[PDB]
Design a protein around this ligand. Structure first.
Ligand SMILES: CCCCCCCCCCCCCCCCCC(=O)OC[C@H](COP(=O)([O-])OCC(O)COP(=O)([O-])OC[C@@H](COC(=O)CCCCCCCCCCCCCCCCC)OC(=O)CCCCCCCCCCCCCCCCC)OC(=O)CCCCCCCCCCCCCCCCC
Ligand SMILES: CCCCC/C=C/C/C=C/C/C=C\C/C=C\CCCC(=O)O[C@H](COC(=O)CCCCCCCCCCCCCCCCC)COP(=O)(O)O[C@@H]1[C@H](O)[C@H](O)[C@@H](O)[C@H](O)[C@H]1O
Ligand SMILES: CCCCC/C=C/C/C=C/C/C=C\C/C=C\CCCC(=O)O[C@H](COC(=O)CCCCCCCCCCCCCCCCC)COP(=O)(O)O[C@@H]1[C@H](O)[C@H](O)[C@@H](O)[C@H](O)[C@H]1O
Ligand SMILES: CCCCC/C=C/C/C=C\CCCCCCCC(=O)O[C@H](COC(=O)CCCCCCCCCCCCCCC)COP(=O)([O-])OCC[N+](C)(C)C
Ligand SMILES: CCCCCCCCCCCCCCCCCC(=O)OC[C@H](COP(=O)(O)OCCN)OC(=O)CCCCCCCCCCCCCCCCC
Ligand SMILES: CCCCCCCCCCCCCCCCCC(=O)OC[C@H](COP(=O)(O)OCCN)OC(=O)CCCCCCCCCCCCCCCCC
Ligand SMILES: CCCCCCCCCCCCCCCCCC(=O)OC[C@H](COP(=O)(O)OCCN)OC(=O)CCCCCCCCCCCCCCCCC
Ligand SMILES: CCCCCCCCCCCCCCCCCC(=O)OC[C@H](COP(=O)(O)OCCN)OC(=O)CCCCCCCCCCCCCCCCC
Ligand SMILES: CCCCCCCCCCCCCCCCCC(=O)OC[C@H](COP(=O)(O)OCCN)OC(=O)CCCCCCCCCCCCCCCCC
Ligand SMILES: CCCCCCCCCCCC(=O)OC[C@H](COP(=O)(O)OCC[N+](C)(C)C)OC(=O)CCCCCCCCCCC
Lengths: 469, 89, 60, 81, 64, 164, 184, 49
């Protein structure tokens, strides 16, 4: 369905005028929804954890990959709604949020690259998919080329991602030079015992992991996140992280790695502490993303990680979308617009948001407490599953460091809510324009999922037991 | 494999310790890819195996597309500033 | 009646414990090649290229 | 007891001491790349330094894991303090 | 119970409609037909989940 | 039409007997039920209906306006595409024995018996060599699992259908 | 003959080292691009020497004929500032350059070995003191060369890879237009 | 009116169009705390004109 949409969109957009942009996005939006609800039944193929090799063993399809594909579709639906629908109908919002002509095509191609990374069974598939996603993401970072910061960010992305792509390619070719193979399927317990692949496989892991920005190579990506337009930042800080992490979770090439243990510890410490002095909202959220990446990095040290990874990545994606949507919604109530690409920059600009929109601040409180991990919000159960996994496997010191990082990052999570519930002197009385019905419903659905999803926990585990065992 | 390895290492060092211009960074990227392909092709010959050569062909095509996109990004960056600084990024 | 109800609840809890241990063990059992990799082309043994097929290159 | 312990040592192993500690640590880590002008050059130097240091650290671990603990402590001290 | 699952999922839809009304700075009962639409949609999702779970239990039982 | 490689025999993909592990495109379409055609029609209607309903909820330009005919036409074509994809997947899953397949199992038995009476190969004669038939089968087998990502179909008359 | 012709590979290696140094040290970045072209001719020489003259021709066709041409086109149209290599700017790197050179080169030679002991890992790198015995057989009756085999596997065994590459090339068209053209 | 504090209670700037001055561009400052905005509508008035 995705390839078809890309071909049709290139043709249609070529024959369309710049004023049709939003309409076109709306079309693709509904198309994606339809694919999600009419093609869902294919989950049945994976009953009892049946695995299928496809395309002459280039691709692998199982229940894990099918779930990740559904999640990526859902994320694309949510993010494309933010371009297809106006928050308000006034002139300022036309200036703030207008989709570029080719942006939707770049999004769909990037999604294709991500889904191909997830399903990669051979290293040539992995490299082609990785370069597809990387090139698309550079172009997505650059497409708002009136912005000085965005163009500079795109250059930085191109060069750092190119160096890391080279590291990945070199890893794959060393693996080939040792084994005369391009597939991890040729690895057996006997082969792992017989040969030292650790340096090759960790080089591959690090090449992949630095591309989503773990420590100590975190600042460049955080800079890119700060300096992109906000509706671009929502997309580019989530999709690559999901695709790369899902591939590493499914590949299991770093089990009980000392190097990955040390880098995960460093990532948790850097992400928690380095978020403390941040005053810009996007930098704060980027450090939050770094800390949650460290949480998920811990699951690369053990087998049977699928339930805890899938739970964590799902609830994290939901929370990330919710917090960015809340920040976008709050733009209407701020006094000072910093620029047209990042209308809101500083956390302090949210001061007194409760007096302008109380239920927006309730949504913020729910999301922030989920990030902290208060039960019965989804974030608590994500962290609980991760702790169960790591303590079952003997990672005691890392569990203590996880607790400490959670406590530390709670401070900068609470910063948002703290300023948001203080008093402001001039508060809103009335306004004739209402924010869009569609986007408000989407945000509310995300909030409700975060709040009440725990009710389905045991049902979810029951289904998981029959599709993943 | 010596020539590929030396080319890759020296190109990487040139990229990292580049403090002169941005074109050197572009060139060092291209030549690191060349070194990787050389290593791969020698192993392909020594195994008499087509998989290495297939990957090398794909690497060449992807290097072409990456060059095109990188230079498009550079031109878009130039459009707003009219010049590239010796820190131009 | 209080004792009977509490015992029924404890029995259901022990059932859930048994089920959890069972699923834990089953997930760790190794699967057949057809179920884990390929259910139609189920032979792991490769054939290689067919052009210059040399009598004597096949080895079990 | 009330001033030197309850509002002295116990706040030091508490909100006041932790606040001061986190302030210095956060400042140090964010300023890890403070004075630099060209983000490209600095970030490239960081990836080279990371790769080389990881190689040397792992070589040390193969030798003797106890010897690497002080080195990791020193690296953390460099980064956060 | 399926009926209880449908009531609960429809209540989730009602909560979604209420929160969306509030976030738009509108009264609770602003467009009451939206409550019906939201409840029906979320009840549909709850029904799908219920049926999938029931099939999963059936499969677990048939391997005995 | 002699297989070059060993395949599994009557393997269980689900709770129903296997009819065809890699059914031909012609058979997948030919075995479609009226319910599958209802799915095709439903998607063909749903996409333009969705675009109009979305317009109603939150107009692109403040004042409601029915979407132009160019977008309705594109929506109709793409909706047909989604519907055909779903119908193809439903029929395919009947061929794998993942959903209920009694009508299809009987019809396949009759069709194979008739062809055997006629002396023909059960899966047709191919214009490809057996090696290319094997490569084609290994490209198309279970490709319906990738329906979200890409379309791929069995257009080759190969012998690797997983039966006796 | 023999003395020169035995060390042709070693000469290509030495020339490659020299060409890389000249790329990095060039005053004019156009001269740097020319030294990159020289390095690619040297790589084509090496590929011919190891039996891959078809890849020699492909590299000449694509990396010089297309990529280097685009490089020169861009540096001609664009205003580039560059500073010269100097002690004041670059002697500060020498310690890190030396440590990184040694560590990266040694590790890049060691990643190929399968010996448990690190010193043996490095020693295997310099362990080809022997000649390969080239032998004949008669099982290949077709005239199948490297290009033909690549076509055979790329279009049949790995057709999916070709189609995905088509998408990548589509990106190489659509993206440049998206960020270098201003619509309306 | 009270001076904004941050997540650790440290002093935090207040921002409006004052921070887009002439003497505060090219400021030496970490990107985390730098307030000059080269995309601000008052610094980008006549760009590419
Ligand atoms: C599909 C939908 C479109 C159907 C068109 C016609 C269908 C048909 O009935 O053909 C009968 C036709 C003749 O049937 P027959 O006479 O009974 O022969 C019986 C056996 O087929 C006998 O076969 P055989 O084994 O004896 O011989 C080998 C086989 C060789 O067959 C193959 O090698 C095909 C294997 C390739 C796999 C194709 C999968 C599709 C991939 C789509 C793109 C994915 C890219 C992924 C990117 C990431 O047959 C041939 O020799 C045919 C050679 C080429 C014929 C001409 C090719 C025309 C291509 C352009 C078609 C345009 C149609 C109009 C526009 C629509 O069967 C064919 O083999 C023709 C090839 C089929 C077309 C292949 C590509 C179709 C278009 C791409 C699909 C796009 C997706 C759209 C739908 C997506 C969901 C909505
Ligand atoms: C783009 C730029 C392109 C540049 C290319 C040039 C670079 C070429 C090579 C560089 C490649 C990339 C380098 C990446 C950094 C390398 C770091 C790295 O891999 O982790 C190490 C390397 O373990 C070596 O044994 C390897 C030790 C390192 C080798 C020794 C150092 C030699 C230098 C001599 C001075 C992997 O062990 P690990 O973590 O799993 O640690 C343990 C341990 O190995 C086992 O005992 C356990 O059983 C296992 O479970 C695990 O827990
Ligand atoms: C398991 C997890 C998977 C999925 C769970 C997620 C969501 C629940 C499932 C389905 C969601 C679909 C819900 C459809 C029913 C929702 C619904 O009442 O209509 C809309 C929003 O409708 C979407 O914006 C439709 C957006 C659909 C996308 C929602 C995805 C989130 C809200 O009504 P509303 O009274 O404010 O709408 C009125 C009215 O329609 C206009 O005529 C008026 O002029 C205008 O003032 C407006 O206020
Ligand atoms: C009518 C078509 C509608 C289907 C459209 C689905 C869109 C997915 C979009 C967004 C993802 C949201 C989370 C998906 C739910 C997981 C279902 C499942 O049970 O996950 C399991 C695997 O559990 C896991 O690993 C852990 C999942 C972690 C979930 C964490 C969030 C929990 C809170 C969610 C509360 C549920 C809300 C219900 C509202 C009444 C896979 O189940 P399955 O692969 O067999 O497919 C299901 C059959 N299906 C295709 C028909 C739907
Ligand atoms: C939800 C289901 C449970 C509801 C139980 C009570 C139902 C009735 C609540 C109620 O009586 O109204 C509460 C409050 C008052 O209503 P009202 O007078 O309209 O507000 C003034 C401005 N309109 O309504 C409000 O003012 C809404 C203002 C919200 C304030 C946001 C800050 C509070 C955040 C709560 C923290 C939740 C964190 C969740 C984490 C887990 C908690 C266990
Ligand atoms: C073996 C491997 C396993 C890992 C174990 C390794 C252990 C050693 C790790 C060392 C790594 C270095 C850590 C670097 C952070 C230190 C930053 C720093 O120097 O801050 C010290 C801080 C001084 O702050 P100052 O305001 O100047 O003094 C007034 C205090 N009332 O002084 C303070 O404020 C601290 C007061 C708080 C006292 C402790 C509070 C609870 C603990 C946290
Ligand atoms: C979180 C998910 C939100 C779901 C809320 C469920 C719906 C609220 C239930 C109460 C209700 O429906 O009564 C209606 C009442 C009317 O309020 P209003 O919208 O202003 O309309 C009157 C003015 N024309 O609505 C209300 O005013 C009640 C508002 C309820 C929102 C929560 C109250 C504020 C936060 C309470 C903290 C407690 C959190 C839960 C811990 C228990
Ligand atoms: C002719 C055209 C015009 C008429 C249209 C006719 C359509 C017929 C059907 C209309 C809707 C009936 C079914 C849906 C019930 C929704 C009723 C409603 O309007 O909201 C209910 C309640 C607020 O109702 P209301 O008394 O009007 O207060 C508004 C401000 N005080 O708000 C709430 O209670 C929110 C509760 C949400 C959470 C509850 C979860 C518990 C389960
Ligand atoms: C040795 C490295 C390469 C190994 C073998 C060569 C590979 C094949 C080369 C293909 C030919 C095309 C590319 C040639 C590279 C270009 C050389 C070059 O960079 O020349 C330009 C440069 C000008 O720099 P300039 O400003 O004059 O430096 C003054 C410093 N005081 O001038 C200089 O930097 C120095 C003067 C260069 C003179 C070049 C003369 C040869 C011209 C090419 C001939 C090709 C063969 C015929 C059987
Ligand atoms: C293994 C050890 C695990 C526990 C020790 C490390 C946990 C770090 C806690 C983070 C923290 O200290 O947060 C600081 C909190 C209070 O915040 P505040 O300092 O007043 O300012 C921040 C709020 N503002 C900016 C709005 C003013 O104080 C504490 O709760 C310390 C209790 C630790 C018990 C000793």
């Amino acid at each position: 369905m995705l390839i078809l949409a890309i071909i049709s969109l290139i043709t249609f957009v070529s024959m369309s005028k710049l004023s049709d942009n939003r309409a076109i996005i709306r079309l693709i939006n509904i198309y994606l929804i339809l694919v999600l609800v009419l093609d869902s039944f294919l989950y049945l193929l994976f009953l009892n954890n049946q695995t299928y090799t496809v395309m002459g063993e280039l691709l692998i399809f199982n229940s894990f990959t099918f779930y990740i594909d559904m999640l990526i579709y859902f994320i694309m639906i949510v993010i494309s709604s933010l371009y297809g629908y106006n928050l308000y109908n006034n002139n300022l919002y036309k200036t703030l949020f207008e989709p570029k002509k080719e942006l939707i095509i770049l999004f769909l191609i990037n999604i294709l690259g991500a889904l191909l990374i997830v399903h990669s069974n051979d290293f040539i598939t992995l490299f082609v998919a990785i370069e597809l996603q990387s090139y698309s993401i550079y172009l997505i970072t650059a497409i708002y080329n009136s912005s000085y910061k965005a163009s500079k960010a795109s250059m930085l992305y191109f060069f750092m991602g190119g160096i890391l792509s080279i590291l990945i390619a070199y890893s794959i070719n060393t693996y080939y030079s040792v084994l005369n193979s391009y597939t991890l399927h040729s690895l057996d317990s006997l082969i792992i015992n017989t040969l030292d692949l650790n340096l090759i496989l960790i080089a591959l892991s690090l090449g992949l992991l630095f591309k989503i920005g773990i420590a100590p190579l975190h600042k460049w990506l955080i800079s890119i996140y700060e300096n992109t337009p906000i509706l671009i930042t929502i997309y580019i800080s989530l999709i690559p992280k999901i695709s790369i992490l899902s591939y590493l979770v499914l590949s299991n090439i770093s089990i009980n790695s000392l190097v990955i243990s040390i880098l995960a510890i460093l990532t948790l410490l850097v992400g928690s502490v380095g978020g403390l002095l941040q005053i810009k909202i996007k930098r704060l959220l980027a450090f939050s993303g770094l800390t949650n990446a460290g949480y998920m990095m811990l699951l690369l040290l053990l087998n049977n990680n699928e339930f805890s990874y899938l739970y964590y990545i799902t609830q994290y994606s939901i929370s990330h979308l919710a917090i960015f949507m809340i920040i976008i919604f709050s733009i209407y109530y701020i006094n000072y617009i910093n620029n047209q690409y990042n209308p809101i920059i500083y956390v302090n600009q949210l001061k007194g948001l409760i007096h302008d929109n109380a239920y927006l601040v309730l949504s913020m409180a729910i999301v922030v407490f989920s990030f902290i991990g208060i039960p019965p919000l989804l974030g608590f159960f994500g962290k609980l599953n991760i702790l169960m996994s790591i303590l079952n496997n003997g990672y005691y010191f890392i569990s203590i460091v996880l607790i400490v990082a959670s406590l530390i990052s709670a401070l900068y999570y609470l910063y948002l809510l703290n300023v948001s519930i203080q008093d402001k002197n001039n508060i809103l009385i009335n306004s004739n324009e209402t924010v869009s019905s569609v986007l408000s419903y989407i945000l509310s659905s995300l909030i409700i999922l975060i709040t009440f999803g725990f009710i389905y926990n045991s049902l979810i585990i029951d289904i998981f037991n029959v599709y993943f065992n | 494999m010596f020539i590929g390895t030396i080319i890759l290492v020296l190109s990487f060092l040139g990229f990292v310790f580049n403090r002169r211009n941005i074109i050197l960074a572009f060139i060092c990227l291209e030549t690191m890819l060349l070194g990787i392909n050389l290593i791969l092709l020698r192993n392909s010959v020594l195994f008499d195996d087509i998989s290495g050569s297939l990957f090398a062909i794909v690497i060449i095509i992807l290097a072409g597309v990456e060059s095109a996109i990188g230079l498009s990004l550079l031109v878009s960056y130039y459009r707003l500033r009219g010049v590239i600084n010796s820190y131009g990024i | 009646d209080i004792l009977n109800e509490e015992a029924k609840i404890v029995q259901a809890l022990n059932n859930q414990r048994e089920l959890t241990i069972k699923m834990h063990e089953l997930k760790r059992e190794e699967k057949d090649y057809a179920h884990s990799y390929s259910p139609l082309f189920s032979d792991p043994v490769p054939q290689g290229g067919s052009i210059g097929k040399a009598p004597g290159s096949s080895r079990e | 007891i009330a001033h030197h312990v309850d509002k002295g040592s116990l706040y030091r192993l508490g909100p006041v001491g932790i606040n001061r500690l986190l302030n210095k640590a956060s400042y140090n880590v964010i300023n890890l790349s403070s004075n630099t002008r060209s983000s490209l050059s600095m970030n490239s130097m960081l990836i080279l330094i990371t790769i080389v240091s990881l190689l040397l650290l792992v070589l040390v671990m193969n030798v003797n894991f106890i010897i690497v603990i002080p080195v990791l402590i020193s690296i953390l001290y460099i980064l956060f303090s | 119970a399926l009926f209880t699952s449908l009531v609960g999922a429809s209540g989730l839809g009602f909560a979604t409609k209420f929160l969306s009304n509030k976030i738009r700075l509108k009264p609770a009962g602003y467009y009451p037909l939206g409550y019906v639409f939201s409840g029906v949609a979320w009840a549909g999702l709850g029904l799908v989940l219920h049926n999938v779970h029931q099939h999963s239990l059936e499969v677990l039982e048939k391997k005995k | 039409s002699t297989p070059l490689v060993k395949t599994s025999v009557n393997y269980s993909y689900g709770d129903y007997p296997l009819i065809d592990a890699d059914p031909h495109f012609k058979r997948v379409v030919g075995y479609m039920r009226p319910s599958d055609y209802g799915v095709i029609g439903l998607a063909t209607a749903a996409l333009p209906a969705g675009i109009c309903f979305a317009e109603w909820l939150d107009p692109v330009k403040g004042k409601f306006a029915r979407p132009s005919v160019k977008f309705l036409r594109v929506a109709t074509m793409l909706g047909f595409a989604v519907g055909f994809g779903a119908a193809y997947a439903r029929s395919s899953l009947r061929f794998f024995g993942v959903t209920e397949n009694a009508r299809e199992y009987k019809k396949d038995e009759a069709q194979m018996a008739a062809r055997k009476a006629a002396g023909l190969e059960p899966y047709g004669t191919s214009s490809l060599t057996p090696e290319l038939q094997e490569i084609a089968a290994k490209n198309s087998a279970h490709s319906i699992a990738g329906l979200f990502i890409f379309p791929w179909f069995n257009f080759v008359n190969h012998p690797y259908h997983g039966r006796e | 003959m023999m003395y020169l012709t035995y060390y042709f590979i070693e000469i290509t290696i030495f020339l490659a080292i020299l060409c890389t140094i000249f790329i990095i040290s060039a005053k004019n970045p156009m001269v740097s691009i020319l030294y990159m072209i020289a390095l690619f001719v040297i790589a084509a020489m090496y590929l011919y020497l190891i039996g891959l003259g078809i890849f020699s021709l492909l590299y000449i066709m694509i990396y010089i004929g297309a990529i280097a041409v685009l490089f020169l086109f861009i540096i001609t149209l664009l205003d580039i500032n560059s500073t010269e290599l100097s002690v004041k700017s670059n002697i500060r790197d020498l310690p890190l350059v030396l440590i990184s050179l040694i560590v990266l080169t040694i590790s890049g030679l060691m990643i190929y070995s399968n010996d448990s002991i690190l010193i043996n890992k490095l020693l295997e790198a310099f362990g080809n003191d022997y000649n390969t015995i080239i032998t004949q057989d008669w099982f290949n009756i077709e005239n199948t060369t490297l290009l033909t085999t690549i076509g055979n596997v790329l279009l049949t065994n790995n057709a999916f890879i070709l189609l995905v590459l088509a998408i990548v090339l589509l990106l190489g068209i659509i993206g440049p237009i998206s960020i270098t053209m201003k619509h309306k | 009116d009270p001076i904004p504090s941050g997540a650790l209670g440290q002093k935090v700037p207040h921002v409006d169009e004052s921070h887009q001055d002439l003497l505060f561009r090219t400021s030496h400052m970490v990107e985390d705390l730098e307030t000059y905005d080269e995309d601000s509508p008052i610094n980008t008035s006549d760009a590419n004109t």
